[PDB]
Amino acid sequence: STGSATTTPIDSLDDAYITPVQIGTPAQTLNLDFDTGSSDLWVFSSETTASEVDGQTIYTPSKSTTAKLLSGATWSISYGDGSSSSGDVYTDTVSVGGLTVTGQAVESAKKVSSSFTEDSTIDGLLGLAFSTLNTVSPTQQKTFFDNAKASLDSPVFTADLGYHAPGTYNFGFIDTTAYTGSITYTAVSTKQGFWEWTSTGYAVGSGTFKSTSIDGIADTGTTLLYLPATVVSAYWAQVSGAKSSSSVGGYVFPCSATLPSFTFGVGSARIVIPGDYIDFGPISTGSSSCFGGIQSSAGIGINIFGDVALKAAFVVFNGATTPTLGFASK
After folding, report:
1. Is 175 part of the annotated catalytic residue set?
2. Cα-based distances in Å from 87 to 43, 84, 143
3. Which residue range is the domain that position 143 belongs to?
4. Which candidate in 33, 35, 119, 279 is catalytic?
């Protein structure tokens, strides 16, 4: 089997991407944030505290003839941005782009933090990291991909995120029309539960490539590119007037700037992030200070190849017995 679904930016900055997901019988379609940095499929629901729901579409398990309470199971998750959610668990039929999993754990939120409430466009998350990170207790549950894997034509999924445009998540096949040149594959460590890999270096604009190992995670659920302070300083030093602002929470730059590109290494291959991808717009409405899309990972504890990086590539998440990651230009 295979599946193919379009993923759409939630706003004009590509802050996140939503993908329609069918849950239950008859189908209830919710728009979920596919997150290769976490491993829980959770949804706004009829159980979510009413004051914490503001415009989201909810899953109502009592209206699904295939929903079953997973008795005694609870979940609770905290994300890198400080947001969180928790609740109980149902199993139900879940379909993405024509690919169906029966008996998928659907984690129903009883509580969500303010950031989730305030984002009316995201109805929940669909985790695509390794199932070892799944938070369901006392019986850990499998991700949608893990459940689907054995049925797929090939044990892979691909992320093809758009810049200010829709893109695609495919399951079970590699669309050879969706990228240019060849795909370069690189080793993955699953020791921390992430799609963790090592970039071979970077360049800023038309500058020379610096060969240096940068361990980080491929994370579709993180907006920006978070890299070591040395690398980030070298980038922003090429933008007149750019500075790190403790009050804003990262590097800002004059909105009048033209940003240089940023290149990262994948083995001997190179992925180029155009400068425009690094512009996250005014820090507040009407400001002439703009927020940068490359930020320091210092104090996160891990480097994160988030959407800023991934949307410059066609990315293969290869879930074979020994997982790997592939990157192609597009």
Report:
1. no
2. 10, 11, 17
3. 5-174
4. 35
Q: What is the largest CA-CA distance in the chain?
A: 60
The answer to whether 284 and 277 have CB atoms below 8 angstroms apart is: no
Same domain? 197 vs 271: yes
Q: Which of these three, 158, 174, 190, is where a domain ends?
A: 174
The single residue of 86, 108, 131, 199 carrying the catalytic annotation is 199
**For this structure, is 35 an active site residue?**
yes
Which experimental method was this entry solved with? X-ray
Q: Counting beta carbons within 10 angstroms of the beta carbon of residue 43, is it exposed (0 to 12), middle (13 to 18) or buried (19 or more)?
A: buried
Final residue in a domain of this structure, among 174, 203, 231: 174
Amino acid at 119: D
C-alpha to C-alpha distance for 70 and 162, rounded to whole angstroms: 37
Resolution (A): 1.1
Give one word for 72, left, alpha or beta, with left for phi > 0 and alpha for psi -120 to 50.
left
